[PDB]
Ligand binder design. Structure first.
Ligand code: 7EG
Ligand code: 7EG
Lengths: 9, 229, 236, 9
């Protein structure tokens, strides 16, 4: 998910 | 946790500092309308996600739980922000400083005018209640933590209580009596029921525009939509 | 007006006596359950509940004052919310199960008989667990259900004043109950918040339930009553 | 509408 990346990122 | 140890003034100032910026629309057809809004909301989502991590207690949650809450409340968060921006622009919705639309312009997209009226009605409610920015950031954080809390939790309810205490503290500072405090607290939280309603109608309308392929949707937005289905 | 002059106790007593009865289903439990038969039982049940709800609403303090058109509007908007919070309340002391009727107790397994229904079942169950955890009282329940009726359609809308006045009165009523229960001012605020935040989820379940009903209708699974079709044709 | 009639009586 793009969401996972953004939350991690 | 780190949210529970905070005082009412620390909570407010933390939320105020975490506030996302007001983005601009790219400088009306049905496709042009949806194009501007999709582009705008897409960029807003990125700031929201980073805003969420700055919300006291949200980082303590697991990655999967953070994902679930955002997937559930993202449109609610966008809408309550829109309503807040348009508060001192009655009869109009301030999507962006260079994008101020009234109900007439909402008619250029089928099924959108109903959502516009609900948004405008919410803005009038905020205006009538004379909603404060400190109250606004509290409500927005409540939406983030509450909206998807029963699709899973004691930790989230602990933070929700803290924001409730934070709200009450703001009203006590304004010189409101205890009776006026409970009553306005109730008035604020009841609006969240309508914001949820607007989100669900807006969620279906987005899926509608998706089906008609009126404009192509971003990968991020399509992900958030495929969570409510 | 009659609603504003009442005290908190007279408010509670009025709401408690206005409470609709718990209806029975025509469930003859030697039939396992077909997707059609399941929807048939629920529709027939909900349709009979609607009649009692309409007459219950007329007994809600301040509702009588409104115009017919506003009455109709509030009911068209909140009818599924009222049904669901009533269902959740009935199912409070039946963990993992939904008490649609005393002769109709269902868990989420049976909710899989209808496509797209088990998601709504899980939400209703989670709400029931929340009521159970909060140790929700009947006096608080009748307040919440009345709040739903007056609030859910108030922003779709002259005198929205009167509705808000009654809402403020029901709020005062809820606080008084928590005060007599021995809860501190902090606990009163928090519990008030916790209760009203449920309404956001009840709204959500209703909206998802509203869409699922429009699905079954256009899927022609089991025909809907003329009253139910009216309530649905008011919510897209 | 049935709702209006039932609200009347
Ligand atoms: O299909 N309906 C869409 C809609 C609506 O009906 C009303 C408001 C919005 C919107 C757009 C931007 C915001 O910051 C908040 C709400 C939207 C919206 C929401 C998400 C988008 O990617 C584009 C538009
Ligand atoms: O399509 N989904 C329908 C549904 C659901 O998913 C969950 C609960 C209910 C229901 C049934 C009876 C009640 O008194 C309250 C809710 C219903 C329901 C609502 C209205 C009906 O006419 C029949 C069933």
């Amino acid at each position: 998910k793009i969401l996972h990346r953004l939350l991690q990122d | 946790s780190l949210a529970l140890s905070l005082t009412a003034d620390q909570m407010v100032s933390a939320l105020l500092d975490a506030e996302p910026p007001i983005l601009y629309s790219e400088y009306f057809s049905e496709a042009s309308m949806m194009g501007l809004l999709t582009n705008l909301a897409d960029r807003e989502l990125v700031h929201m996600i980073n805003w969420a991590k700055r919300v006291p207690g949200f980082v303590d949650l697991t990655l999967h739980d953070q994902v679930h809450l955002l997937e559930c409340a993202w449109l609610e968060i966008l809408m309550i922000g829109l309503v807040w921006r348009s508060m001192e622009h009655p009869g109009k919705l301030l999507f962006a400083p260079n994008l101020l639309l009234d109900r007439n312009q909402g008619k250029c997209v089928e099924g959108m005018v109903e959502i516009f009226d609900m948004l405008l009605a919410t803005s009038s409610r905020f205006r009538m209640m004379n909603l404060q920015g400190e109250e606004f950031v509290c409500l927005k954080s409540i939406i983030l933590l509450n909206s998807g809390v029963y699709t899973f939790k004691d930790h989230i309810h602990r933070v929700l209580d803290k924001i409730t205490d934070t709200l009450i503290h703001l009203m006590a500072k304004a010189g409101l009596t205890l009776q006026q405090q409970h009553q306005r607290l109730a008035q604020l939280l009841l609006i969240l029921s309508h914001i949820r309603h607007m989100s669900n109608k807006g969620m279906e309308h987005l899926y509608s525009m998706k089906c008609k392929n009126v404009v192509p949707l971003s990968d991020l937005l399509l992900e958030m939509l495929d969570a409510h289905r």
